[PDB]
Symmetry: D3
Subunit: 240 residues, 6 copies
């Protein structure tokens, strides 16, 4: 995959697809061009039997500084663009076929929260800094940012961070439940890899069934899930 | 001035911050039909008053609130006309959470002391909450011979883990403010001496934001909890565009 | 006397507390179709027994339950008619959560040791839970080649945060009792040596409440998680007024 | 002469609530909204009032919405809702829209908030909103969703085309369309029938139904037995 | 099956299991006895391969005239409060917990009266054919209670909003043609052709792979409760499950 | 759009874009190739000022006879995703109004794009059926939900369970489509409705139709919030 995308890099090592956001000079701000390439990246890696697990990380100091202000600014064109943001950030990614891990190396802001939580698991550096700074720019959180908070962070802490726009570090992200674990930057990569390797060792069809089933069952009552969760178990047995 | 305006509630505005003080301290701020009707009045008035940028909900004396008024809200009412009971229940809701949970302006519970039973609805209806270490909390309904009434259980469901919520509802054991913070019921517990100033600093942060934007953000978050991600794509973009208009 | 009544389970009552003991410790209390059927009978029976006011679900020997019986419940059922698989799954759900999640009487899981896989459904169905620090937990399903079956994933979703739930479900890693309390899976982890004492203490607090009021409280909480605030205004007052009747 | 914009009459337990802005085809102003809240709240505590029939004065039932800093809008939107459906949908007492003529736009919400509806064949309905450049506002679109099938709802919303009392009965929008010369008599037979019911039980029944549509079967086993037990208490 | 239940009769007929509510002296009123027997009947038939389709009908002039007012209360007051939990659960158990997502396809053959508590099993049955001569009514209100158990939900699923509210609120009676026109039943036909029409339908159902039929009908009933996005996941899970189990 | 797509055709005439399913030799059966091209079609038409309303129709006798009856397991995920992508994920909440003009055979997987389209007119002469059950599959993709949304409970279950076909007039009486007209009069009746819609402000039309489909999922209280937001979003995008 060398040199194939202008704003993103993919480097696969032993089954682990590192997907690197690559606009370091713009702190990996998400522009419409990055959005369209990320869609391409996800669809491509889906059908690549070399990629058993995807690790979503950032080049340089940012994981992502959020949506690209300049590069985002005919009425209907905003339709397409907002769709393209959703398409990779979570429509493909939340229920992706393969297991996914956010490896948060640094800055994570605003619209970054959507792919952050769409990725199944997440590890950050203690040194990573997060914040929902939309309120200070005069917009509520856009896209799925607020649902991504609601799914991972308790009600009062979500509201505090959304309403104030204050930043918090990696330990605090983990305390809150936004990520699985926060570790020193120097251990970020190996901790992530150790986890990806554990996941690589499961039957991919089974893992998909388990991870999609959990995400879905939060939406459903116990009686609905009896039907739903056995349908997944049985679907897993067909396809495995 | 709102001086002398209500019998059971005082409003004191400082610098954009409207301190709403439940004011039945000889009855530990027990929530009676008079208080419930005046609190409706209060929220509607403050809503339309540009001098109030943030509402801080707090109590006079030792209590924040000791709960619904056992005399005036329950015992005096329960043997009278059914249709009045239903009206009284509804008036309690109207201010505890119907106007308050999606209130136009940002809201903070400042819990100075006792907080029992029906006080959990407005507690959680307020966007944010700081309590005092010295504050005692309890869901004492079970020990009084009723399940939690109104939205008390949903207030718990929204902010506290399932195990912890069931434990406190079922046993009716009390817990103090550091425990309230740890469980997620409030944002922060601080010693009483430091309560007002900690609350004041959060309120000034909130007063710096564009109110309309702050309203879209807080309202959108509370509602997105109820919706799937696909529903939220629609809904949350609608709230951002609605916000842009306004 | 419930003595000798069932092959795979025991019931011991003790001053209002009915200890329901999963009893196949040679097989680490693996849940076979026979245990499932007998547990249905247990639960229906004790529902109507006034001598039993709180149920404590525990295991004989070293395990709470090692999960579904790999042989009796999986291997042997796959070799029978398809239509029987249907009956078998239904019978598992019947006792694990269908009767048990909204059971009439308060329930506590007293998790003395191993709890795996299918064990998580009755675990979270039970209202409250105390485990031994020494107890080991595991969603080993992934490592056996299946996603969690029955209501196991829902069990986690209700009690354990999103990231933590996926971590354990996706990796199949085990964790001990203190980490289970920390995650919100149980109420409390204590040494094994103290487990029964602490549980009885909880059960006795529960026996003090009015049973019908307690029912209403614990049922209304579990259902209110499912409903918006406006739906719950209706629902939760109907629970309160149903409780006053009964 | 209690209200400016609304007349009320109570005969043999039937409270006719009459929208009374005839000159304006009963278009719903902020003043009427505020007064309608007063009306509903007043009539609820009235021991003589058993059923409420909601109609318009002269020829319209209502022509819909009658068309201060930003935040005042919050208040005007809330007051509309408060009488149209927040109090009205789950009203303590049984409720009948007696739709005598014109029924456009925002009048769809109290229309459907009322338990039952009898219209006159000669009545015209419309979701004109579109033609004026706005999508249906308040709860108009949900009211259609509740009562009129998917295809027809979208049809009348998207086109703004109008329809008679016969086509409204047929679509599920109302219970019956009958001639305007019989509208009142038909409505009153229904109302009398409803008055003979135990009011608390009727309330448990009608509220029960409306909620149960949002709930699953299992959720409803809990819930509808709670309304029933609730009824045994309050009755 | 012969003479095995005091209040129900089962007649298996070359794949079609006719299940007959059998208290015609009492208009097939559903007592606690009948509730308990109907649970046994539904569990027994599920596992009997001679039953491919269940047809639920009543002996006599009635389908069922609702809950048995006399023996519900007779049994309930001979006992404490908790006895009502058990009795209500047993009613729900056969009327719809087992019946609504039943493994085998089901048809209500409604030959006469169908009142109150009867609507739950009627709607739990996948499909329904009635006699023009059959009379339906929700008379709970005239008896001074709201519809109990799943009756109002049974209505909400099959009959439009105004019409359900009208019949629940008034307790007014309606006939077979009306019931089919309201969407309560699939079809209404003269009582003389009731058995003919039902059996044609049951035999059509017999043509299909049982597991595939179960997947289709269960998945349709669940899907009403779910969004499109949710159904994308759910409905392909049922399809794949069917392919695994269809044999 | 002359000869741009292999299995589909586009013909705009004065605001109306006719999207024509174009495998009449296979009764317009939906192959993976068709699914990919339909995505591309729906995206392209979304950004074209020329198309104001889309009309979804079939070349030859069929509207569509349903899915066209592999490799690594993963390939299925993609093919299932691309089926849904045009049938309803793009189509159900499409920016521009959509009408299904059902000229003939409508089977199985064809009910998903049928119900996703906002409005529908079929020919009396058209035949529908949910033939899945007969081939030993329950209905796939969003077929059962498409029924659940437009057709009553007893009827949906009837047609799903029996696999019996029904004509255009029965389709309209069930609620599957808006209206059934003779075939001879399908293009005319449809164009006239298409034209009524073209007279609406597009952004206002999108708010109203998306808001209606979504409000079916929400309580009254959720809808007060959601419908007033949609209205205010409308007034901005203008
Ligand atoms: C829904 C949403 O996404 S809204 C959320 C976006 N909100 C934000 O608050 C991000 C704003 N950015 C920042 O706070 C900072 O750039 C930080 C903290 C991430 C890093 O700060 P520094 O290390 O001081 O870097 P600095 O501020 O010089 O930014 C470096 C470059 O990245 C660009 N950049 C950073 N963030 C963004 C962004 N979100 N969009 C577009 N460009 C950005 C900066 O403009 C700058 O460009 P330049 O040097 O070509 O002029
Ligand atoms: C659904 C519900 O909300 S049910 C009720 C839930 N609330 C409770 O269980 C709180 C009960 N415990 C108390 O109320 C105690 O008063 C505490 C812990 C708040 C504080 O106790 P103390 O400072 O020792 O005060 P004490 O009990 O003597 O009473 C203070 C005064 O307020 C009254 N009061 C306190 N709480 C309430 C209440 N909820 N309702 C009515 N009156 C109350 C007392 O009756 C007394 O009034 P009096 O002098 O006119 O009789
Ligand atoms: C969907 C599901 O529920 S998949 C199954 C989920 N369960 C599991 O993954 C737990 C499987 N069990 C184990 O790993 C172990 O038995 C432990 C850890 C609980 C206990 O370890 P040990 O003390 O070393 O006991 P050991 O493995 O020797 O078991 C003793 C007996 O219990 C039986 N047993 C234990 N668990 C089960 C089970 N889930 N099903 C059937 N039999 C079981 C063993 O097969 C063995 O039988 P045997 O003596 O007749 O040969
Ligand atoms: C929760 C609920 O289900 S609300 C109750 C709903 N059911 C009803 O309202 C049905 C009431 N019954 C009736 O309306 C009539 O019995 C009809 C229409 C069913 C049949 O009328 P008829 O042919 O005149 O028969 P009739 O009324 O003489 O009753 C025949 C016998 O069946 C009994 N019976 C009929 N319905 C019931 C019932 N729901 N519960 C108990 N017994 C009943 C009658 O009491 C009578 O008993 P008896 O003759 O041994 O003393
Ligand atoms: C309780 O029944 C089951 C439980 C599990 C747990 O993984 C899997 C399949 C089952 O049938």
């Amino acid at each position: 995959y060398e040199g194939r995308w202008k704003t993103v890099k993919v480097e696969i090592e032993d089954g682990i697809a590192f997907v690197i956001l690559n606009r370091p000079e713009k702190r990996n701000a998400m522009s419409p061009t990055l959005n369209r390439e990320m869609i391409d990246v996800l669809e491509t890696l889906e059908q690549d039997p070399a990629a058993g697990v995807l690790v979503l990380t950032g080049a340089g100091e940012a994981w992502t500084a959020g949506m690209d202000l300049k590069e985002y600014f005919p009425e209907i064109l905003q339709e397409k663009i907002r769709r393209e943001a959703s398409q990779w950030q979570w429509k493909l990614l939340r229920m992706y076929a393969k297991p996914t891990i956010a490896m948060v190396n640094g800055w994570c802001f605003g619209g970054g929260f959507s792919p952050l939580v769409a990725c199944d698991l997440a590890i950050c550096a203690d040194e990573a800094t997060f914040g929902l700074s939309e309120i200070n720019y005069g917009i509520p959180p856009g896209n799925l940012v607020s649902k991504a908070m609601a799914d991972t962070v308790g009600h009062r802490q979500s509201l505090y961070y959304i309403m104030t726009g204050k930043t918090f570090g990696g330990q605090k992200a983990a305390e809150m439940g936004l990520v699985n674990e926060s570790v020193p930057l120097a251990q970020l990569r190996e901790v992530t890899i150790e986890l990806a390797r554990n996941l690589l060792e499961k039957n991919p069809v089974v893992l998909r069934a388990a991870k999609h089933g959990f995400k879905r069952c939060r939406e459903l009552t116990w009686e609905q899930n009896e039907d739903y969760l056995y349908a997944k178990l049985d679907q897993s047995r067909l396809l495995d």
